[PDB]
Design a protein around this ligand. Sequence first.
Ligand code: HEM
Ligand SMILES: [Ca+2]
Ligand SMILES: [Ca+2]
Length: 307
Amino acid sequence: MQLTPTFYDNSCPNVSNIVRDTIVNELRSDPRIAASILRLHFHDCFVNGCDASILLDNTTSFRTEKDAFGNANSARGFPVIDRMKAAVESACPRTVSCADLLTIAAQQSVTLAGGPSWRVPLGRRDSLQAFLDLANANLPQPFFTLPQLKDSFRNVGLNRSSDLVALSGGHTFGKNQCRFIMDRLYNFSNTGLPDPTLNTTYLQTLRGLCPLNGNLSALVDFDLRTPTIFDNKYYVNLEEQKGLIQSDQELFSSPNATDTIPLVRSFANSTQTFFNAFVEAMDRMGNITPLTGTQGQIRLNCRVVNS
Ligand code: HEM
Ligand SMILES: [Ca+2]
Ligand SMILES: [Ca+2]
């Protein structure tokens, strides 16, 4: 069954409004929640598609994706999803799936952070199991080279370099742990030297935030220009070699970036171009192997399968 943006227009026309309100209140006490929710949707879609499998807690039969290298002590905002889920369930009993709910939450997060506004396709249903192993194999790592980054995206169904470059724009806000850049700052690829593609002036700043043998869990902003605003500044940083993690700067500095370089500049020069590309890429990621029709179910508690 084809996904459609009007899927809940009769059964729950206030779904997006409820999701938005939940995020608006949360943002007052946690300005990071918007970035966190977008990332949860990303991690959900890259593992067996956008089926809310990532929201599932542990069971004696299958392990939770929350303990995957890419989610453990990293992914956050799960309680917030439960909150909007409960609210939507009150307004529309057994109607909105967790998969669709997370997709909407991601879209609203982007808009609330100042990003584009659009209606995401709906009609996805919830999985009957979680996929820890698949999450460890599919979720890309900050130390991936451009070829590996491209491979990771193609693996889940995104062949276009525009998908990678546009979706990587999600780093226009949010936090990153010192842990993932220690190598770039003091010993990149066993050279005993910092990553040469990292601006030397910025290198000094990052070294002060992440000293050697310091707190590896300390947080740093992905975008030094506008840490919490969803804009194309992320790409301007790349042009000046100010991308935060290796996977960011390679989109512009990798020897295999002949196709990504023009895309980075394109999005850097025009907000509209980036926003259009971001929306397009987001809907493509949102269309990865979804469960539709009668497949899967409408989970009442996103943490457990219905019984
Ligand atoms: C191209 C591959 C990518 C890699 C290797 C990558 C890597 C990372 C890493 C290492 C973190 C920091 C986690 C932590 O410190 O706990 C992170 C955070 C984040 N990423 Fe990415 N990422 C990628 C793609 C994306 C995509 C496609 C999106 C969404 C469109 C996204 C959205 C985010 C957000 C918003 C955060 C901040 C989360 C928060 O502050 O809670 N990332 N990413
Ligand atoms: Ca999933
Ligand atoms: Ca920004």
